[PDB]
Ligand binder design. Structure first.
Ligand code: HEM
Length: 186
């Protein structure tokens, strides 16, 4: 996982569950409890798993609920740390640029495997967005969508159309419906 992003997760976990839980979880994988992950670093997916496993153990929450909560809260973290991605945008625009943003932010990484997040309009008031990744981070994806709606103060309903693995990739397709019309024919 890209280092910059794992860094946001550590801060988000502190915001959700407190410094004791995070410090102890980080120690349990042999990190300094105050470690600062730099943009010159990546973190092995399995270390992240082990950290989150420890958070689940300590909080008594299922790890899927943790990812869902982290996904919701991490939008706030992103908006504070990387404000340029939110500046002067609405929710639909933000969601539709995510696929490209994830390519752009992992370009420089050898063997990069960003999630794909292709969105396409399917109605005046709806888009379809499909999460595709080897990583199976469904609750995180859903949480980020929920957090995005909160941050942009734009009400949406999220219909989970299909979820499952295909050709080695996990895939989750959702239909996101906006309370008020967002597109027009042109
Ligand atoms: C400013 C906002 C955001 C930034 C800067 C950002 C950036 C990133 C980066 C760099 C990664 C690491 C990918 C890798 O190492 O392969 C990542 C992971 C991920 N991103 Fe974002 N992201 C943002 C918002 C979102 C949103 C809105 C969604 C979904 C709607 C999303 C979905 C995901 C998911 C599900 C992962 C986990 C990796 C995986 O499942 O393969 N992100 N993000």
């Amino acid at each position: 996982m890209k280092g910059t992003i794992v860094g946001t997760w550590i801060k988000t976990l502190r915001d959700l569950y407190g410094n004791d839980v995070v410090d102890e979880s980080l120690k349990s994988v042999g990190w300094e409890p105050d470690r600062v992950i730099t943009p010159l670093e990546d973190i092995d997916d399995d270390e992240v798993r082990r950290i989150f496993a420890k958070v689940s153990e300590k909080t008594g929450k299922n790890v899927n609920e943790i990812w869902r909560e982290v996904g919701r809260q991490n939008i706030k973290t992103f908006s504070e740390w990387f404000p340029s991605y939110f500046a002067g945008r609405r929710l639909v625009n933000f969601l539709m640029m995510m696929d490209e943003v994830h390519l752009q932010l992992t370009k420089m990484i050898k063997g990069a495997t960003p999630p794909r997040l292709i969105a396409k309009p399917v109605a005046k008031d709806a888009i379809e967005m499909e999460y595709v990744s080897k990583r199976k981070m469904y609750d995180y994806f859903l949480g980020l969508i929920e957090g995005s709606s909160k941050f942009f103060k734009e009400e949406i309903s999220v219909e989970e159309v299909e979820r499952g693995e295909k050709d080695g990739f996990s895939r989750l397709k959702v239909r996101i419906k906006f309370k008020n019309p967002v597109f027009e024919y042109k």
